[PDB]
């Protein structure tokens, strides 16, 4: 196996991959785009 610190970006365990996917930043979306209002 590879060490915890590698020169390349090590492949993640699939469960961790899923964890990252589910915890991504979701920006606040306004009801009306602010450019469409006075």
Partner 1 sequence: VKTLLPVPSFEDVSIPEKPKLRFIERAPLVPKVRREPKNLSDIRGPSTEATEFTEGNFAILALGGGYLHWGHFEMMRLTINRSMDPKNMFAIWRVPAPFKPITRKSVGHRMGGGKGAIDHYVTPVKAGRLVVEMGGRCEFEEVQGFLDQVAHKLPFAAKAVSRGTLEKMRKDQEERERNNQNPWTFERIATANMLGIRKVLSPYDLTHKGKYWGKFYMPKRV
Partner 2 sequence: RGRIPGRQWIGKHRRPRFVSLRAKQNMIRRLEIEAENHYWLSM
Query: Residue from 9, 30, 32, 38 that binds partner 1 (CB under 8 A)?
Result: 9
Whole-angstrom distance, CA of residue 5 vs CA of residue 20: 19
Least Cβ distance, residue 14 to partner 1 (angstroms)? 8
Whole-angstrom distance, CA of residue 9 vs CA of residue 20: 15
Choose among 32, 9, 4: nearest CA to 20: 9
Question: Would you say 33 or 38 has its CB closer to partner 1?
Answer: 33
Question: How many chain residues bind partner 2 (CB under 8 A)?
Answer: 9
Catalog residues that contact partner 2 under the rule CB under 8 A: 2, 8, 11, 14, 17-19, 21-22
């Amino acid at each position: 196996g590879s060490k915890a610190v590698t020169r390349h970006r090590r492949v993640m365990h699939f469960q961790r991959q899923k964890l990252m996917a589910v915890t991504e930043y979701i920006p606040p979306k306004p009801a009306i785009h602010p450019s469409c209002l006075p």
